[PDB]
């Protein structure tokens, strides 16, 4: 019948953009009924901002309600729990989805950056790889930059956080780069955004194609 | 009611161990009925080997049939399709799950191996990272070796295949290693097993902690 999902603010949104938001999605396979309410609240009792709202009846007959709530970074850091409560249809119990900052010890990531040896054929392209590890909570964002301008997201792929043997998480990120970029200027930064990185929630490493 | 899954032979099993097997799993949430048949066949008509079989009624009331079929590597390479057919309960249509070698062009992986700079605290540990890329079909196995003996699986983690921009796949693998290992002998191999690697379906790169 009804499924509901709520996302986490990305670290990039908490600490860089600094306008973080969370998104509550409801998927109702049989909208046989009237309105499906969906309501935000905070565990503390404090008020929430207004949220966007959007409904689509989908071609297969499913109804799809999305809602987006802006949250405070400071509130998020102090422990707020944000809650999306789904209400009405043939639901005895309401559904409720929630998100809060992860428990446990904190620990800034270590970043390492590596370049690929020239491969026959490629010549005009090179591969950069960034290993980011030992960070605690696994929440993390990753940017690559060049001429102190952040590259587009889709230029790189980053893997999902997995647990290291022992404690903390790691993550790999990969960016192909072109001769026109590296001769332009032979420096690329791999930057992680993480709540425990401290002055300002980031750690970065520079890497170069040649020596 | 009834779900069914069938796995793919790992490349490590096709090309190294050389006794590859596939596993057909049925999960039936309401075993209200009698026997659930599960039957192997090949798309070509040719006979199959005998398979292991195992049933467990689970505590939550689910019934769980697993079956394991040995297959030929040469048969697999020539295009066989293996099929697990699930039969009986309140199923009008039978279910059928299948597995076959992936379509399209082939291309051996490129392996690159990197070591981590000393990190304060660690000292007695170092991190190795292997980038494996541009391979086609995404099916791949990864071993790390030391003193020409393959390390245990759980010593390393490897990521899921993702598509590079353009063509082919990549994969990262990570292995922590200890001072006792690298002073013992400072060479570790990262080995990929892949159908297109040709003499013998493998490509490897050596890496060292110091220079």
């Amino acid at each position: 019948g009804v499924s509901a999902y709520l996302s986490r603010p990305s670290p990039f949104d908490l600490f860089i953009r600094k306008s973080p938001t969370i998104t509550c999605l409801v998927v109702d396979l049989a909208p046989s009924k009237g309105t499906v309410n969906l309501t935000w609240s905070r565990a503390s009792g404090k008020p929430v901002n207004h949220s966007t709202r959007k409904e689509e009846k989908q071609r297969n007959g499913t109804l799809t309600v999305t809602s987006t709530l802006p949250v405070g970074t400071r509130d998020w850091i102090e422990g707020e729990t944000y809650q999306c409560r789904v209400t009405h249809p043939h639901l005895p119990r309401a559904l409720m989805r929630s998100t809060t900052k992860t428990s446990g010890p904190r620990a800034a990531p270590e970043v390492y950056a590596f370049a690929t040896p020239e491969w026959p054929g490629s010549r005009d392209k090179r591969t950069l790889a960034c290993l980011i590890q030992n960070f605690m909570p696994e929440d993390i964002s990753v940017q690559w930059l060049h001429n102190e301008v952040q590259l587009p997201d889709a230029r790189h792929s980053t893997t999902q956080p997995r647990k290291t043997k022992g404690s903390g998480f790691f993550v790999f990120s990969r960016l192909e780069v072109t001769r026109a970029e590296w001769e332009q200027k032979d420096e690329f930064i791999c930057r992680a955004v993480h709540e425990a990185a401290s002055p300002s929630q980031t750690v970065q490493r520079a890497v170069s194609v040649n020596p | 009611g009834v779900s069914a899954y069938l796995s793919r032979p790992s490349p490590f099993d096709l090309f190294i161990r050389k006794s590859p097997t596939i596993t057909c799993l049925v999960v039936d949430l309401a075993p209200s009925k009698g026997t659930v048949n599960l039957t192997w066949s090949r798309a070509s008509g040719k006979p199959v080997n005998h398979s292991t079989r195992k049933e467990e009624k689970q505590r939550n009331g689910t019934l769980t049939v697993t079956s394991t079929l040995p297959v030929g590597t040469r048969d697999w390479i020539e295009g066989e399709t293996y099929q697990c057919r699930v039969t009986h309960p309140h199923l009008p249509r039978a279910l059928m799950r299948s597995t076959t070698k992936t379509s399209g062009p082939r291309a051996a992986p490129e392996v690159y191996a990197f070591a981590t700079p000393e990190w304060p605290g660690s000292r007695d540990k170092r991190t190795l990272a292997c980038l494996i890329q541009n391979f086609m079909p995404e099916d791949i196995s990864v071993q790390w070796l030391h003193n020409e003996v393959q390390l245990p699986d759980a010593r390393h983690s490897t990521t899921q295949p993702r598509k590079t921009k353009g063509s082919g796949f990549f994969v990262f693998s990570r292995l922590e290693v200890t001072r006792a290992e690298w002073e013992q002998k400072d060479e570790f191999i990262c080995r990929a097993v892949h159908e297109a690697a040709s003499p013998s379906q493998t490509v490897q790169r050596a890496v060292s902690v110091n220079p």
Partner: antibody, heavy 121, light 111 residues
Framework: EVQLVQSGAEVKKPGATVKISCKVYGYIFTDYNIYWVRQAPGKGLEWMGLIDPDNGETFYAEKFQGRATMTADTSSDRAYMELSSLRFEDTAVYYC??????????????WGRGTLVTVSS | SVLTQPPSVSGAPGQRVTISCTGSSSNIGAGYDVHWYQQLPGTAPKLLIYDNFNRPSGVPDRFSGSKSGTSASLAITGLQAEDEADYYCQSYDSPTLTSPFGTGTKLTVLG
């Protein structure tokens, strides 16, 4: 493979609060109640309470009312237990457990490894 | 309500030993299922019996459960060194809405 992964050991001063975590893999976190069970060193199992992840509702045995708070972070597949006003006697291993049933009373099938909580001056 | 078990019980390998679990008419006596758990030193409990007499996937058949009136009983035939563990029963207790564990029994294997 279904797994209840519990957090590491915690060491607290009397009067403190600790939040230990039970992270779920292998089914839909929000489908089934999670139960929490306490075990003081050398002593028997005690059933503390249960939470329903789909909606946040909880229930506690009398003894733990007030000083245990069960929560669930659905966005991250994580059932939390929060112990407060910690006392020496609150030193125990705390387990989370479950059964993929719904509508069934006991016989927990899947168990975390336990989180030890040690309270000392 | 407490579900009470004898604090301890004794073995001698290959022999058959029983553990009992006694409640009242508001739990076991009330038609509610009994279950059993086994705990080895330093490990989490494992479920051995559920719904009175059922074994979960992988438990040897030498373990059996029965439920009499207000009591239920675990029986281990062919006692083995490895059976040396703590055992707890559990049932539902409607006056409290809880599902308490029994006081627990320490199995000791003789010899």
């Amino acid at each position: 493979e279904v797994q209840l992964v519990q957090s590491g050991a915690e060491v607290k001063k009397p009067g403190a609060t600790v939040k230990i975590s039970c992270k779920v893999y292998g089914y839909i976190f929000t489908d089934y109640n999670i139960y929490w069970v306490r075990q003081a060193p050398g002593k028997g199992l005690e059933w503390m309470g249960l939470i329903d992840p789909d909606n946040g509702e909880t229930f506690y045995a009398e003894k733990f009312q007030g000083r245990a708070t069960m929560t669930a972070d659905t966005s991250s597949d994580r059932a939390y237990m929060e112990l407060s006003s910690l006392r020496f006697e609150d030193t125990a291993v705390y387990y989370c457990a479950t059964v993929m049933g719904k509508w069934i009373k006991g016989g927990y099938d899947y168990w975390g490894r336990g989180t030890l909580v040690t309270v000392s001056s | 309500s407490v579900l009470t078990q004898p604090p301890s019980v004794s073995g001698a390998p290959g022999q058959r030993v029983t553990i009992s679990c006694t409640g009242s008419s508001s739990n076991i006596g009330a038609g509610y299922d009994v279950h059993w758990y086994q705990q080895l030193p330093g490990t989490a409990p494992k479920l051995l019996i559920y719904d009175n007499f059922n074994r979960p996937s992988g438990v040897p058949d030498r373990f059996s459960g029965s439920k009499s009136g207000t009591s239920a009983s675990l029986a281990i035939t062919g006692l083995q060194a490895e059976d040396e563990a703590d055992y707890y029963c559990q049932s539902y207790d409607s006056p409290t809405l809880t599902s308490p564990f029994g006081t627990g029994t320490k199995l000791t294997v003789l010899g």
